[PDB]
Amino acid sequence: SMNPPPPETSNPNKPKRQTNQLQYLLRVVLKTLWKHQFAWPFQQPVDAVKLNLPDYYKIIKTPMDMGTIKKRLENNYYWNAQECIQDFNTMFTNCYIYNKPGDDIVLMAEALEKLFLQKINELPTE
């Protein structure tokens, strides 16, 4: 019923770096997806209380959202591009698992995922 704590965006024990690929993921990939007309459901964690989704955090055991990814990029949480790409892929997959094919939210996630794949196809070499 109650929401879990959000995914961590700060952890002094976790190793991290600034890389050209992580800068690309913030300034090109996230920038593009964040501004999209369909971004808004993905800009913060799923509020399963407000949305009356009492099963959401029973079905989705690795929550992720672009608000969390934005904070992780801006606050240098990540070691490499793969960690950040995995977060985006977890966000999309969660949406596809919880919802039905052709649901509005699934079509919105698919539109963001198409733009995501366009942009990571052109990920710079390290």
What is the resolution in angstroms? 1.4
Q: How far apart are CA 82 and CA 99, in angstroms?
A: 26
DSSP 4-39: PPPPPS--TTS-----HHHHHIIIIIIHHHHHSTT-
Q: How far apart are CA 68 and CA 74, in angstroms?
A: 10
Domain extents in the chain: 19-123
Are 65 and 45 a contacting pair, CB within 8 Å?
yes
Residues 6+ apart with CB under 8 A from 92: 109, 112, 113, 116
From residue 72, how far is each of 37, 59, 82, 102, 104 by CA, in Å?
22, 24, 13, 30, 27
Cα 15 to chain centroid distance, Å, stands at 20
Which CATH number fits the domain 19-123, given the four candidates 1.10.940.10, 3.30.70.260, 1.20.920.10, 1.20.58.1610? 1.20.920.10
